[PDB]
Amino acid sequence: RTLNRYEKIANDIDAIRGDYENLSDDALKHKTIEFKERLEKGATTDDLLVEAFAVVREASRRVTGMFPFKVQLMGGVALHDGNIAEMKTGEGKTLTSTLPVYLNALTGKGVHVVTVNEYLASRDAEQMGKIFEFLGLTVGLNLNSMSKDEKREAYAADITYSTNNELGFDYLRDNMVLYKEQMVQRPLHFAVIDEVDSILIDEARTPLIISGQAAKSTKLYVQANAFVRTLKAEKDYTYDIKTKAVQLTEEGMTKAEKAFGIDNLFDVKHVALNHHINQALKAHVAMQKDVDYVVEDGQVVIVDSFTGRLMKGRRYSEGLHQAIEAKEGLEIQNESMTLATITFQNYFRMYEKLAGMTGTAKTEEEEFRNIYNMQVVTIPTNRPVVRDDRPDLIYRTMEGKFKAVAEDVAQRYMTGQPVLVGTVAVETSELISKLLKNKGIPHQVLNAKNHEREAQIIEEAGQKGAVTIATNMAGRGTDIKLGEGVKELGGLAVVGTERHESRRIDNQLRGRSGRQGDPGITQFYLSMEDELMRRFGAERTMAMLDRFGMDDSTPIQSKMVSRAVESSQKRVEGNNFDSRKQLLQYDDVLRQQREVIYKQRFEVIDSENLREIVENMIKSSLERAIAAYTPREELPEEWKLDGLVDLINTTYLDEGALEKSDIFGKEPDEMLELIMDRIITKYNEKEEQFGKEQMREFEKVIVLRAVDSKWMDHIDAMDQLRQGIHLRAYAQTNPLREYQMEGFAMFEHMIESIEDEVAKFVMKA
Amino acid sequence: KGEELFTGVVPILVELDGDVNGHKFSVSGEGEGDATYGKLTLKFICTTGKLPVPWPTLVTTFVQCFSRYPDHMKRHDFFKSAMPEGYVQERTISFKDDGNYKTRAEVKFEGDTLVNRIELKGIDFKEDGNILGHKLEYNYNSHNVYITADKQKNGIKANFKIRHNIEDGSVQLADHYQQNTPIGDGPVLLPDNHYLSTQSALSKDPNEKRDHMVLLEFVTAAGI
Amino acid sequence: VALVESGGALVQPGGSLRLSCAASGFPVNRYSMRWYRQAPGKEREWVAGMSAGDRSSYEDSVKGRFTISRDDARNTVYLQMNSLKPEDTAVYYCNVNVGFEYWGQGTQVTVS
Amino acid sequence: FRTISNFMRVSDIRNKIIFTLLMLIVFRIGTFIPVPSVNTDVLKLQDQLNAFGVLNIFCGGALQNFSIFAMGVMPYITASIIVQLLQMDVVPKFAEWSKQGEMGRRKLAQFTRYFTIVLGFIQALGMSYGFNNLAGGMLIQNPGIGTYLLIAVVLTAGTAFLMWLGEQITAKGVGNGISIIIFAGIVSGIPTILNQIYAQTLNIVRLLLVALAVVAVIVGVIYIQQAFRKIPIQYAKRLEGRNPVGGHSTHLPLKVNPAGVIPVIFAVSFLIAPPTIASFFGTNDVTLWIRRTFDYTHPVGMTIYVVLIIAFTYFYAFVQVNPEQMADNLKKQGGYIPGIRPGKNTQEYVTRILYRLTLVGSLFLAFIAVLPVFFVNFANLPPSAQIGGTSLLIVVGVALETMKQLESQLVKRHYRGFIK
Amino acid sequence: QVQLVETGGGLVQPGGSLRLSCGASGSIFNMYAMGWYRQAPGKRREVVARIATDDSTMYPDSVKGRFTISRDNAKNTVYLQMNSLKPEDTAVYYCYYQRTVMSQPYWGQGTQVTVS
Amino acid sequence: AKKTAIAIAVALAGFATVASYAQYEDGCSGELERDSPHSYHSG
Amino acid sequence: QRVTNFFKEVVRELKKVSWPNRKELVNYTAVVLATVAFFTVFFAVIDLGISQLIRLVF
Ligand SMILES: Nc1ncnc2c1ncn2[C@@H]1O[C@H](COP(=O)(O)OP(=O)(O)O)[C@@H](O)[C@H]1O
Ligand code: BEF
Ligand SMILES: [Mg+2]
């Protein structure tokens, strides 16, 4: 068992500890210099494990006062081996993160400590920069707000603390550079992902997109808004509540055809018109105002489902964000156009070693074995969990739950025990705050709109008598330290308000008061018109068990509805697991296409003279022109050499350099070599005429422009057919194989088009 | 807005009648214009017979609203202020070593489509020069149109010189003085000096019979 | 379509010079080739130009002097100047119109 | 060949075709292990060839059969189509398991497993009872209703093992599991049939005309299997690709033969159910009329067998494609036929297309099932060399649709890049 | 492998008795199944007598009980004693053997017992 | 009608079991056969 | 006259099926005859092999 290997390493580290704690300063930095020289002398990091962990535990004693535990040493050993090390939420995982980060930063390449949002990235940076700058290592902190040179200075440190968005977008904007020295990332070495179940499991579904800006349509959004604002909610559109999808009813289609005056929406001549109506119809009803965006100074800023924060530079795509901007009369702005695309499995599986930790891994354990080939090690507590995680309170209708949660936070305020009220939305958090404005309680709401102060709200959320209403911002990494006196009255009762989309996420919300040894009394409240029940609850208990009698002065004590709540949450997790398996095996082909094309264009950036690569492109286009005009099926002298010689005179060889008498009845192989010799001579005269480094710069610009424009089109065509391939199961054909074959043929027509573009632009210029 | 409404492709009718030295000409044509890329793809057909003055002396007279604008010069256009209300332009075109064109055109959105109605009157001509001797190569050069505004007439005065490749190996430098007038009187936009960097291409159709000019043309602006 | 001028430098009035413009991407024997001059501040005015064959026309103000010819084998147009006057101090250009209109990089001639 | 060299150079697909061949060996050794207590002497002597009224064998006849795999995966085929027929709004435990997602679908597949093991048990009882009742008066030693159960549970455990290695070869070997096993249950009888056709011997002229008629009907069957009425579909919800090509445009491939082979399988079931119930009453005057009119080689048996093929392939085509479920599925998420209002009118459009294309695959399947009588009469072959039918239609289907799936690994290998 | 002769059949009226003695050449004989079948025209060919290693005699439904089969070594002979004959049994008779499981049960020649 | 459908189940099922008496005679095989995307505007 | 229109539009919708054309048709017939020949020969060989090995195992 690897747990006994881990505690024998932890016992080694405990034993050797005696020759520290008397060792003064400026011998420990000297030991970092010692491990650097002994590591470029012949030993490996596994052999330097116990001494490096001993010196980190003594320097972490000395700098910050948090002397590490034994289960934290077991966590460091479990992370260094590549294994996810689930340590329960509260047990000090930030301070285990400095053990293998220090160990693997000694060699020289980067160590990316990835985490979920910028608050706990900045928090861990200025808390562990003290330990890491106590031993002569650098620390870069990476952010959204930085220019390219600051991010390159941050990445060039020995350790980089960042978020997963900024890492992924640095990788994409590195593969859209023009010079080799405009790249911020080093070649990738190691990541210690804090909260791996968000990054690698939950939010590894969503793909990173970079979209440069296209043309501005503004008339049709205002037209489609002024139409769909008059549609008489259920008689003309429908709204599937389970998956948020609105369509028009048969009356609404006739109304649209007589409001725009047209003949038939569903023609082909009006596809764009139909598109705008559908997007306008989704921007009204399927996504409400404060639930999943906000309006900040005339821009709709969309709010993360997962992290809870608002992400600022990001836009909805396929023409939706403009329909939201025209819903509210804001300035409609330009229309995006996808340039680059990655997903978090495809990005994080390029890292040559990656570790990670969380509190709630075990539920998804095999997935870390099926997707990433990492096993989840389970590591002990070091102090028993005395956290009274009480069971639910299912109610009837919503406002009964809100009246009860205000009564509960009132009667916990009258003792002075701090209460953290979790939520998920921002309009329900300001709803419950205006339920606590009357009843007279001081509180501090922490929405997506109140991020600007929140780093100090946390240090007031744990003294006597605090009340703190928090959305998902304070739901994963937030360390609410208990103040003075509060531990005696059982500190930090966490009152949930609705059930999340996994046992992982709400177990982590309860972990916000599970903190080491300290007691905390958590509780969830639920209802039956809670929207996870109305979306995802089976109809065998909705109308059949909404018969209790509507008073809501008590919870529901009948375990039919508790079975219903657990069944609903389990089918949410099941839908997400099926979607994650599906899109894993469909994104694992454009993984291969993008690896090939990014490898070739990184090779055409950092080559000294790409004379040979462009010549190989021109011969690979020439042979295909030759074998196109000279087929096998026809016998010779009926090959139509006139069109072939005109294509060579128009495309490769001036307009009078080739005539039919130069070929007239030769086999196609020798006629292409007597084209290719003239091409090589013409190219070498153009090289000695145009310059030596200037022709390199010229052909590099031509090549990169061709690769980038044809690759924009290929991403867009592949994601155009990925929509339609699930229809292709009605011929009983396993649609993944259809997609993979058809995408390969589409990629080869893309590369044939690249080589044609590079050929005629290089030698008709 | 106005032409910010016409970001999509625009139909372009061109109608031209004119007289030089008592000799008649009438050329029509149709094509498309685009503003977000800013190009003109135009198929033009001489529907009277033969050209008295040749096609290169015709191309500046044959619609300056189809420019491509980057983000900063969006305030500094006149040609999106008089549209869709309509536009009128007349030019004094002085050929050096020859006479003068006075061209007379209204360029406006008739119905939807951009119609350029041109009547050209070419006076002060001797036939034994180069233009009525048809000494022009079948080409047109790249240029920079200088644009300024006047507020006594609240319109646009444009100055430029153009360069025709003469088939003897010379060039006809000819200067255009251009007057540009709104028809409607709404929000006028009179910017400072700027310049249209323009380039062209003249070609033909191999599957067409009569004497026809095919025009492809790019406009960009800069300066402000 | 890359016209490159070369062979120009500073010169005292009297020492004869040779102007080369090497063309790339088209053959000269089916396109008219031209040379312009430009003083700083003055408009880039016309000097001379061949036209697709066996004739050429010069401007009246430097006639009897200039020679525009071409190596059709070497794809290059040459300009003989013969006996500098200080009026000829200009940036010289070679020019063509092959669909689009193409200049060179601009060569410097200064009659000091 | 230059492509089979490709198939046996790359590592994983060579390992998995070798795993497929090993599992077919593990299959075919079990046909020589017999049922534990049967008198196998009477089993091999019983040869009542054909053209007999009572014996009007169809697919070749399971006469010299009755090994432990002899029940076949035919119980799984009929149980799977029973539960497919029952998901359509009947017994809504299955309807809610269907509409809920895929881990309910695991319980649905488990229901199908237990309903197969039940039908395998009771149909092994019926098969052994009939196959001792007339083919040989005594076939099981120690005979009686207490001892049919041991050999019936041996047969049911056997085809449980056959479904086991079916799902093992579909996990680790090449393609479909039980389709490769059925393909191995059909093509492994052609050695004996070549022995019988040769041992018969228009010496060579007849056999050459036969072989080219076989290749003509096999190219007819590839031409009808591999054909699509590509209905053009159009998703309204993205921007049409900003300058597309339109060559690979999203479509909706209706097969010409949507019902597969299955309608002729339960057409032979409803054919031979009334003779096998009228065989109980004893030889009457009407029983011989019944076995003359339900002998499918005489021109009233061919006609009602053809009309049952036409009827069940219309029915099972509409249960297979299901135009109501696909139109509701199209307007549920976006797309629409260009020109067709996506509620009711798109289901009536795909319904009319589905009738007019089911007629062709319908009479194709009727002809491909009444072909083997029209070779046994008009070519004088041994009347167990019955080429045509299901045994043709699914040999070529399994062969192509594992060739394609096999060579769709090479395109994963063969990415190029523009550099080279 | 073994050579096999069948005696005792001939011409008899319906309502008599016969004794079919089938004698072998190869003398080991401790085998799987010895039997007797017909293949009259109308083929059906039905095992009329069947005897195993346990001598567990098996008979079909038409001729059950009236017949008997007897094995002996020291002259490798099986005995299909036949009683109360019937005109339907106008058939050739055959005596078949088989060594182990399946192992291709081999035939013999027959005796054309005529009864009418 | 959907009641018709359950008949069309049972009518074949029992017949598929009564045909099993004559499975020496049949012997045939039968084949089996079967959020809102968000971008990041650069610049 | 419903049949005399119906069979007409059957023949019309046979002009809209995407039929496999001659090149990959001949490719497919080569494939299927190759697999049936190889599996016939393979099953003949392994039946002879396990027959002649079982008949000495008895
Ligand atoms: N060795 C230690 N001694 C005392 N306190 C510790 C020690 N290690 C961690 N802690 C405390 O445990 C708390 C856990 O913080 P953190 O690591 O953010 O939780 P998590 O492990 O869930 O990320 C911190 O407040 C820190 O003060
Ligand atoms: F207790 Be942790 F920061 F999820
Ligand atoms: Mg943490």
Residue numbers in the entry:
A (entry chain A): 14 to 778
B (entry chain G): 3 to 64, 68 to 229
C (entry chain C): 2 to 82, 82A, 82B, 82C, 83 to 98, 101 to 112
D (entry chain Y): 2 to 202, 212 to 430
E (entry chain V): 1 to 116
F (entry chain B): 2 to 35, 51 to 59
G (entry chain E): 2 to 59
Structure paper excerpt:
The central translocation component is an evolutionarily conserved protein-conducting channel, the Sec61 channel in eukaryotes and the SecY channel in prokaryotes. In posttranslational translocation in bacteria, the SecY channel associates with the SecA ATPase.
To obtain a structure of a translocating SecA-SecY-substrate complex, we assembled in E. coli cells a complex containing Bacillus subtilis SecA (residues 1–778), Geobacillus thermodenitrificans SecYE, and a translocating polypeptide substrate. The complex was purified in the presence of ADP·BeFx to lock SecA in the transition state of ATP hydrolysis. A cryo-EM density map was obtained with an overall resolution of 3.5 Å. Some phospholipid molecules seem to be bound specifically, including one at the back of the channel, which is positioned parallel to the membrane surface with the hydrophilic head group deep inside the extracellular funnel. The N-terminal signal sequence forms a helix that is tilted by ~45° with respect to the membrane plane and bound to a groove on the outside of the lateral gate of the SecY channel, as in the SecA-OAins/SecY crystal structure. Both the substrate and a segment right after the PPXD loop (residues 326–331) adopt short β-strands, so that the four strands together form a β-sheet. Consistent with the single-molecule FRET data, which indicate that in this nucleotide state the THF should be retracting from the channel, we observe the THF in proximity of the translocating polypeptide chain, but not strongly interacting with it.
